[PDB]
């Protein structure tokens, strides 16, 4: 069975524990020391220390998406592409 | 995405951590149950494994 | 006016409250006869507030000493200003409790627990307005760590008003000499939560570090270790005994350090600690004082702040300086690091002034420190009880004590609730 | 620097127009700019978004009088 | 206010050290005890400098003490002027790094460099406004090579606008006492480059030539020479220190001295220099300071100046002088040796003038040129480097310590980089 590690989903905790019993996969509330196939982070990448297996935070999210940074990029492809980028 | 009267959107704020919070809200289960339910399904470790062996059989 | 009872109990609650009776009679000037030779008018305004004027100008302290072994007041009697103390507060057991947590709390402890209190509302009930007690022990024995709590229990509900203190020694993983030790650890901790004010965590690892890396000790002794307990216990209460530019009572520092209930342990710290062969290759300044007291190694707690965020800082600051300075230098630490404070408390440090020093010292500071971070020790203690826990090791001694299997469940949940809403605030 | 001295001598942008020393002066400049834009005034070294000005500058010295989606 | 860090680094770094702060608490009137018993006023005006003022009116030198091994550290203490450094700014480690860049740079000296970084940051915030850092090693050796380079790396990381002089000791081509000094050099030649802003540099060739024909003296050892080169750092810096008519600092010789990034090389030299016995023969004037400073033979480094043409040089008068005899002589010197001279950049001298001159003398110079001829001094290490690589030798002693070997080409490749941009402009 698949094990994910739910320890830090926070706020996305309940809605995957019932999702968890819909696939049948086995849940680790409280975390474990061997390596897990999938580990769900609710706000940094660095909450644990991942070495193998999926997590479901990119690395730096938490940067990007931080209006100065999103608007920079856009205003990057703006000047690349004027009229595509019309929607900011 | 704020949806203008001629049909134009506009793309407001983006979030890295949306609110997966579903309190009971019976919209925001519905929905956010299924998405996480879906992202989970589209990523099964065991999906690629079993592809293959399909093929290969 | 305004006056403390002083409670010891077990070894390292009398070796430690002995230390700090000769540190605050050479403060204040006492002879170890009990007669004052001191050339100050400034050591006898607030003397009437550990000393009790008794016939021919002779002061006698509070100090309550309990034991459940006899031998402690022995050495404690026979030994420096060790007739110093009334002779009849010396309220003595007949066997030690073993290391027995239930011993202590339900039937050795029972039997002495009324005759202490008899002397406690003895001494209380002669002071003209009672601030509040504090008791010195440890939490890793059965005297200590029992009698600490069943006393407390009964002192609380007898004096809901004032002030309680304890400085307790929070076991250490490292550096262990007992076995059951953890047990009584979880056993305690969850009633140091709701009948204390106030509870400094003092781990001996740490004290057992600033020995060997800021003194450069070769060979310290528990007279060394004990040396900085008593500095910090006549540090926190000097704005009580001796004046200043902006006093701070007890009170006033209970008040803007627990932001909740029960978040009532602390980080202490001693800002002039330097060597003996350093000293001449320093200034005494504030900055400097500042920078040794808000680092990761004159903690007396074993527990690195960089893995939490501080709630509150205080900072009783003994010495003449000036108030722009200390507000110079507490403006530079937060904006500096800023990622090691809560967001949601602006401008967490309370500090204090007082103009005397201490004798030889021209400039000091006592920092107690509310951080997130003192959830490590909790949560390194109760993963220790849960491996011999679940697997029930010595656990005969407890259950034929009195006790029943349940205590040991809530105790565990009471102390992980603790870490929990620790981390909640993080 | 080294990333862009050799970035510019693998692709052979260098020429007798562009010298070293112009590359130099074009690394500083975008770099004293992009760590003084953010709020930390360190930023020791060059960021993605400087280096996507650089190569916007390196493109419009090339290719002249062309689109800017062709160049 | 301007204070300088000062940071020692492998025998020759740390016994270098020891002469210069011997020779600066002689100029500031310092006691080996930290007391000040001095005549001059001026002394007292800038020892914020170099010297923090603890209680007592006791000053400390600022200076940090690095090794790999403690034995050196009690030679540092046990000797003159040496109960006066700070004992928790002698940072030390357990063996010496042997000859290994790898050992210092990565494996064994890593775990010292936080403690280094500590000390930094401490002296470094209880000055009032830094200027920059000095460090004084010994390019070739385990530690000073692979700990400096760490050391400097790690603080332009964290400072990337104060000044990184650097005063190294190079390998030289006759007086060797190492098998494996070109490989640590080479290797740290390249981390040079791109983390300091000066450079000086030292051949133990160049100053033994000094002791054996100027001075005449018998038997020349590594007091000499480290006398020299505490000379020329005290020199350096003098316009920081006390007043004068046309002060220098350490950014403006870096400004009238770099005119590229890269070319920050120089080569040292003091002109006041006689035997014993013909001081009295020689009368001590500008147009003599000038004629020893700019002789070939009367300088610190290893390379001869007439095979290149100098791009430019800083010279730091100390003494009372007229800026007219100052001038016209150090223009003379441009019009006779005009071929030795570039031609896209007129006016190479760059002229300070200081008026306390150093304790027992009238007036001294410091010269600092920044020459193409340099270039010889790394030309020579790559030969020996190359002829230690296609028959790899003592390589294991590198690669055994995580150390790959598309490093060393690297390295290599940087240094013909450097030593191509010198020779370009020459052409
Ligand atoms: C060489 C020299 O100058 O010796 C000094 C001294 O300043 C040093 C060595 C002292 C000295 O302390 C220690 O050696 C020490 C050893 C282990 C643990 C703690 C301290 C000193 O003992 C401590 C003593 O301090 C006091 O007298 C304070 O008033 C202190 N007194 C006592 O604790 C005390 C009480 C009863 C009987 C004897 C001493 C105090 C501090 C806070 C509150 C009340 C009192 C002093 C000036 C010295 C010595 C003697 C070496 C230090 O004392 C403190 C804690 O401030 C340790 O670092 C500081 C500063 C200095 O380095
Ligand atoms: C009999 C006599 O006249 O002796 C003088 C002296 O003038 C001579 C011999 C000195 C002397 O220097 C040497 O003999 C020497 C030998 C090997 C390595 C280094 C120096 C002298 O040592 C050097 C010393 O110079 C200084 O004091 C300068 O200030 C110099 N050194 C020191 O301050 C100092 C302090 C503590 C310990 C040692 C030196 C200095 C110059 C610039 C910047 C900083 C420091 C002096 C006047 C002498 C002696 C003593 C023989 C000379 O000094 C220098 C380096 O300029 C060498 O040629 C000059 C001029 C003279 O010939
Ligand atoms: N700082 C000090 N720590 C002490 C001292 N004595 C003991 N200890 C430490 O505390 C622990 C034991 O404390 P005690 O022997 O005082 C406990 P107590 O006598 O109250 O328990 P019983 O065994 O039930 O009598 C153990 O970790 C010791 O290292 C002391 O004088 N000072
Ligand atoms: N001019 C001087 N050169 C020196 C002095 N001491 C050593 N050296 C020279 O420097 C070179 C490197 O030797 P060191 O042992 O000082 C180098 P390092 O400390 O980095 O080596 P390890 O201590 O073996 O790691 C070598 O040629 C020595 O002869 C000195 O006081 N002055
Ligand atoms: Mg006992
Ligand atoms: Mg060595």
């Given at each position: 069975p698949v094990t994910v590690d739910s320890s830090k989903a926070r706020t996305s905790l309940d809605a995957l524990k019932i999702s968890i019993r819909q696939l049948k996969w086995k849940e680790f509330?409280?975390?474990?020391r061997l390596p897990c196939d999938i580990y769900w982070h609710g706000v940094s990448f660095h909450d644990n220390d991942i070495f193998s297996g999926q997590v479901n935070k990119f690395p730096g999210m938490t940067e990007m998406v931080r209006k100065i940074t999103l608007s920079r990029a856009v205003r990057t492809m703006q000047n690349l592409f004027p009229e595509e980028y019309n929607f900011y | 995405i704020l949806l203008m009267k001629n049909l134009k959107p506009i793309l407001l704020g983006v979030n890295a951590?949306?609110?997966?919070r579903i309190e009971p809200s019976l919209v925001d289960e519905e929905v956010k149950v299924a998405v996480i339910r879906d992202t989970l399904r589209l990523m099964d470790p065991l999906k690629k494994k079993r592809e293959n062996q399909s093929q290969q059989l | 006016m305004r006056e403390i009872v002083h409670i010891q109990a077990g070894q390292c609650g009398n070796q430690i409250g002995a230390k700090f009776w000769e540190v605050i009679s050479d403060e204040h000037g006492?002879?170890?006869?009990g007669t004052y030779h001191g050339d100050?008018?400034?050591?006898?305004?607030?003397?009437?507030v550990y000393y009790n004027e008794a016939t021919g100008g002779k002061y006698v302290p509070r100090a309550i000493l309990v034991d459940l072994e006899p031998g402690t007041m022995d050495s404690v009697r026979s030994g420096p200003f060790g007739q110093i103390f009334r002779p009849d507060n010396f309220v003595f057991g007949?066997?030690?409790?073993?290391?027995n947590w239930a011993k202590g709390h339900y039937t050795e402890g029972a039997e002495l627990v009324d005759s202490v209190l008899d002397v406690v509302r003895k001494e209380a009930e002669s002071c003209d307005c009672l601030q509040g007690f504090q008791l010195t022990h440890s939490l890793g024995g059965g005297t200590g760590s029992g009698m600490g709590t069943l006393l407390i229990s009964k002192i609380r509900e007898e004096y809901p008003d004032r002030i309680m203190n304890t400085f307790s020694v929070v076991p250490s993983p490292k550096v262990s000499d007992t076995v059951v030790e953890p047990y009584n650890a979880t056993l305690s901790v969850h009633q140091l939560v709701e009948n204390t004010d106030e509870t400094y965590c003092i781990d001996n690892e740490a004290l057992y570090d600033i020995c060997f890396?800021?003194?450069?000790?070769?060979t310290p002794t528990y007279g060394d270790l004990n040396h900085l307990v008593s500095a910090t216990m006549s540090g926190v209460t000097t704005c009580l005994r001796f004046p200043g530019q902006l006093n701070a009572d007890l009170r006033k520092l209970a008040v803007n350090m627990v932001p909740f209930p029960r978040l009532h342990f602390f980080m202490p710290g001693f800002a002039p600690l330097t060597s003996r062969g350093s000293q001449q290759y320093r200034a005494l300044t504030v900055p400097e004082l500042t920078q040794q007291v808000f680092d990761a190694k004159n903690m007396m707690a074993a527990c690195d702040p960089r893995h939490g965020r501080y709630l509150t800082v205080a900072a009783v600051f003994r010495g003449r300086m000036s108030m722009k300075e200390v507000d110079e230098q507490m403006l530079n630490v937060q904006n500096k690091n800023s990622s090691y404070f809560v967001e949601w408390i602006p401008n967490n440090v309370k500090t204090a002034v007082c103009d005397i020093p201490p004798r030889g010292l021209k400039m000091a500071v006592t920092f107690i420190g509310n951080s997130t971070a003192i959830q490590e020790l909790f949560k390194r203690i109760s993963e220790q009880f849960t491996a011999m826990f679940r697997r029930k090791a010595f656990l005969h001694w407890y259950t034929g004590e009195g006790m029943d299997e349940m205590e040991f469940t809530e105790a565990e949940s009471n102390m992980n609730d603790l870490v929990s809403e620790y981390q909640q605030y993080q | 620097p080294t990333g862009f001295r050799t970035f510019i001598r693998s692709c052979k942008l260098s020429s007798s127009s562009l010298s070293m020393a112009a590359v130099d002066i074009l690394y500083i400049d975008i770099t004293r700019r992009w760590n003084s834009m953010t709020l930390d005034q360190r930023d020791s070294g060059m960021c993605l978004q400087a280096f996507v000005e650089a190569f916007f500058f390196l493109a419009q010295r090339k290719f002249k009088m062309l689109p800017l989606h062709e160049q």
């Open positions: 509330p409280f975390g474990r | 951590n949306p609110s997966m | 006492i002879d170890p006869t100050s008018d400034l050591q006898l305004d607030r003397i009437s007949q066997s030690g409790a073993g290391n890396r800021t003194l450069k000790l070769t | -």
